[PDB]
Design a protein around this ligand. Structure first.
Ligand SMILES: OC[C@H]1O[C@H](OC[C@H]2O[C@H](OC[C@H]3O[C@@H](O)[C@@H](O)[C@@H](O)[C@@H]3O)[C@@H](O)[C@@H](O[C@H]3O[C@H](CO)[C@@H](O)[C@H](O)[C@@H]3O)[C@@H]2O)[C@@H](O)[C@@H](O)[C@@H]1O
Ligand SMILES: OC[C@H]1O[C@H](O[C@@H]2[C@H](O)[C@@H](O)O[C@H](CO)[C@H]2O)[C@@H](O)[C@@H](O)[C@@H]1O
Ligand code: CA
Ligand code: CA
Ligand code: MN
Ligand code: MN
Lengths: 240, 240
């Protein structure tokens, strides 16, 4: 299909079109990407991702069209620790994408250690909300919590300072305009606090024609829950 | 998802979200539900169906919601003969549906011979465009070409006389309103000739909460091509 759209105002337990990878699962009408104990508290060493089952037609070589897409979603992070880790990310990757071996912790379940910073060995575009930046382990991160745009590497092509707020929902709107090739990110907390970051990228040189979209999260030594509360997505092929 | 929609203005050969069953295949940017020879001519004894991969949430017992839906599509029938058979149908059925054994010809690839008219034995709602009605083999049919609404039986609960036009595209709009429970069908040819038929049906008592939608077509001893040219679908769960 040239156009596809779906909306999850909430996430009931009875799901049919989501691919669950790792420790991800539904709990209390929301997706808990990372593992939580019986009391619902976050635990260390956990990675989880979800993908919508239907494949998205991102671009089409034969007709030189590229999709205009928008992803709106909200999530919340919570942890009794002063340094909850590691973060959640919305991503786009080839349809057969699975959790790489050893992609836990700061790698957000998106990259393998050996090529995490090798832009030539990956095919992934992601928007990360990174809460852990210890300069000794996450050497690639700026020294503060941030929102980052990742293109084939855990070392963001761009970051903006972000404030982590325990237990508060962050609403995010990610859009891509094929005409300008601008990938825009707008995130807001309920009090009006706003964050914006943009980056020009030709998705055709990074991703295959058909892709799957979803979210990924992970916790290494430090932990926190990564709760996806809602998600709506839409994409349509346009001439360029 | 509470809402889902997709649109196929045409059907390029590289499909990823379509389930092909029987002889259905893509040819010349359209879906040929029934088999054709080398020079594109229709052949006898052929059945084919397509279903969209993502499951549709038709209703939810938890929230007492029922989905409203709208399916828009166009098809054309072509046959060297003048008694083309057997017809094409838009249908909704359980996710694991497959072509029943012996459902060729007048059964349109939707029902088994032994239970074709047993309502309590089937789970399917379909909108058929039936072009063959010989009373010896299609005993359940009115004695003329017709559009019919089928609810768990090949013997339509409601039909309207229809005119078959070789090679001309028929535009169809099928809508289901959960508030009134009316399933409305509107079909028109490019010159404005219009056909309408509707029926009141409580989908909750006929189909499970999650379903799959698609098309089916078949040709017995008489034949014609069943070319699906375009298709768009949208459904949204609503409180009545
Ligand atoms: O989930 C977070 C993080 O977890 C993993 O990283 C492990 C660990 O790496 C560094 O410390 C290594 C080692 O140091 C020893 O002295 C001892 O403490 C041992 O237990 C540690 O494993 C640090 O980056 C560490 O972070 C903590 O210490 C730093 C100071 O060095 C603080 O700034 C920070 O706030 C923490 O208190 C970290 O836990 C990996 O999975 C990694 O990918 C993850 O991002
Ligand atoms: O495709 C039409 C029709 O073919 C088969 O039945 C035949 C027709 O009724 C007609 O050709 O007369 C034949 C002799 O009686 C009869 O076999 C079946 O496949 C039927 O299902 C189909 O509608
Ligand atoms: Ca980090
Ligand atoms: Ca018939
Ligand atoms: Mn980062
Ligand atoms: Mn009929």
């Amino acid at each position: 299909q040239d156009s596809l759209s779906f909306g999850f105002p909430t996430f009931p337990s009875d799901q049919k079109n989501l691919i669950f990878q790792g420790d991800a699962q539904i709990k209390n009408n929301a997706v808990q990407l990372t593992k939580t104990d019986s009391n619902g508290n976050p635990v260390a060493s956990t990675v989880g991702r979800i993908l919508f089952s239907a494949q998205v037609h991102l671009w089409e070589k034969s007709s030189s069209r590229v999709a205009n897409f928008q992803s709106q979603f909200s999530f919340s992070l919570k942890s009794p620790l002063s340094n909850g880790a590691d973060g959640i990310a919305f991503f786009i990757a080839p349809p057969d994408t699975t959790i790489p071996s050893g992609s836990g912790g700061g790698l957000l379940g998106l990259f393998a250690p050996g090529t995490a910073q090798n832009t030539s060995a990956n095919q992934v575009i992601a928007v990360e909300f990174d809460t852990f930046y210890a300069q000794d382990s996450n050497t690639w991160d700026p020294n503060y919590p941030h929102i980052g745009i990742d293109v084939n590497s855990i070392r963001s092509v761009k970051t903006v300072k972000w404030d982590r707020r325990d237990g508060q929902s962050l609403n995010v709107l990610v859009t891509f305009n094929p005409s300008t090739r601008n990938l825009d990110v707008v995130a807001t907390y309920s009090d009006g606090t706003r964050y914006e970051v943009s980056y020009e990228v030709d998705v055709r040189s990074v991703l295959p024609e058909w892709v799957r979209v979803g979210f990924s999260a992970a916790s290494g030594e430090q932990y926190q829950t990564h709760t996806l509360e809602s998600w709506s997505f839409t994409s349509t092929l346009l001439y360029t």
